[PDB]
């Protein structure tokens, strides 16, 4: 009967979100919805879906997400898993929904709400990247640049000192990956951060 | 962001409903469930839009006139007997800042597409702008 | 209002900003915050 139960849960979540004015009230109302113990992923998934379905990204949903992942740790882990899930399944969303999801996760990252652990699932190689993934990364990284300033961004990326190691963003020195990574990060507009691995091509 | 409009909207929507209640010579709340007022016109309801069925945030009044304190409590707005979640009108209106950002983006991309259609001898057409059809403060629709 | 007890009308509606001044007395600047002053305190020791 989980088909009907899931559908009822999604309808309740959507109505609760749509009957809300500010994110604080929406989080307060969403916590009141009793949900299965292992279905915390459903709430986050549908919050992201509702964010995507709208015409223009509104800070409402980003604020909701960061408040949940600031309330506890299970929500933070759930949102990291959501980013992982949405990355490989990004090719099936239109450009507008893709942009809305990218802004959602960029606002999550910019406030240190999920940690940049998630970038270890990103590999910038044509064997496992598409136009959709490149557009996703473009939008996310630009939005992070306005939010942080490209000054702090270079320390945040250059100095991981944790399990995020950017082994796909700054690809492990191998094959023609470095050329593509450098030229892509320039074409996006970042540029500044890739000069560190610019010299590797001279090394090899 | 204005907490006075929220309570004013609650009060004024309530009295708009009260006019209908009085014209029927009975303002009992049991007789008028939200389906009477908010169901669409084609179903026989009044088709009233709703914006006052929301929780009004509250903070300590001692430290409210002197500092911006976090929302620690919620005061209920218009009450719906039973479990009903009447949708908010504002949730279907895009906020001004998002609309302006999208406007800037869409008009910039339209300018570049107009330039790349002018550089060749083509004629700029619809179904070339289906992505940004109704976007921009002067909506793109106004071109065609 | 004690949260289990009755609620009445204000009995004193004179709280307008007729003074128009915060009086530089109750301001946060010169006040040591230790614990919030609950209304139970205002009822148990009404004159203090």
């Amino acid at each position: 009967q989980t088909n009907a139960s899931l559908v009822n849960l999604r309808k309740s979540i959507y109505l609760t979100i749509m009957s809300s004015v500010d994110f604080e009230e929406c989080c307060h109302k969403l916590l009141k919805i009793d949900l299965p113990e292992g279905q915390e992923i459903e709430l986050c998934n549908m919050v992201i879906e509702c964010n995507s379905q709208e015409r223009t990204y509104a800070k409402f949903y980003g604020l909701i997400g960061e408040r949940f992942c600031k309330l506890s740790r299970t929500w933070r882990s759930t949102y990291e898993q959501c980013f992982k899930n949405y990355y490989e399944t990004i090719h099936r969303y239109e450009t507008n929904r893709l942009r809305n999801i990218a802004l959602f996760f960029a606002n999550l990252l910019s406030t240190d709400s999920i940690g940049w652990e998630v970038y270890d699932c990103v590999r910038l190689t044509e064997d496992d990247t598409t136009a959709s993934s490149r557009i996703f990364l473009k939008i996310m990284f630009q939005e992070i640049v306005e939010a942080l300033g490209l000054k702090s961004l270079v320390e945040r990326l250059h100095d991981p000192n944790l399990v995020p190691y950017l082994h796909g963003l700054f690809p492990v020195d191998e094959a023609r990956n470095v050329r593509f990574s450098i030229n892509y990060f320039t074409s996006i507009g970042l540029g500044a951060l890739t000069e560190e691995m610019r010299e590797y091509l001279l090394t090899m | 962001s204005t907490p006075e409009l929220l309570d004013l909207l609650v009060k004024c929507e309530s009295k708009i409903q009260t006019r209908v209640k009085i014209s029927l010579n009975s303002k009992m709340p049991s007789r008028f469930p939200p389906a009477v007022f908010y169901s669409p016109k084609e179903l026989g309801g009044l088709g009233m839009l709703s914006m006052g069925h929301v929780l009004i945030p509250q903070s300590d009044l001692r430290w409210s006139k002197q500092t911006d304190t976090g929302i620690t409590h919620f005061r209920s707005g218009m009450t719906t007997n039973g479990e009903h979640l009447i949708p908010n009108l504002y949730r279907y209106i895009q906020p001004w800042e998002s609309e302006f950002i999208d406007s800037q983006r869409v008009w910039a991309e339209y300018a570049m597409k107009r330039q790349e259609a002018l550089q060749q001898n083509r004629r700029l057409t619809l179904e070339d702008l289906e992505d940004s059809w109704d976007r921009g403060i002067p909506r793109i629709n106004t071109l065609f | 209002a004690i949260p289990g007890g009755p609620k009445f009308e204000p009995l004193y509606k004179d709280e307008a900003p007729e003074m128009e001044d915060w009086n530089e007395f109750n301001d946060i600047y010169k006040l040591i915050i230790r614990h919030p002053i609950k209304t139970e305190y205002r009822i148990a020791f009404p004159y203090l």
Binding site: - | D7, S59 | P3, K38
Partner: peptide, 29 residues
Amino acid sequence: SYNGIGLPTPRGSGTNGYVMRNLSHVKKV
């Protein structure tokens, strides 16, 4: 009416009062 939260009387507003706790308040030689 209680700890600085609430309105003096529910008469005059289209509401019943009934203030709730936020339930989402982040309590950090």
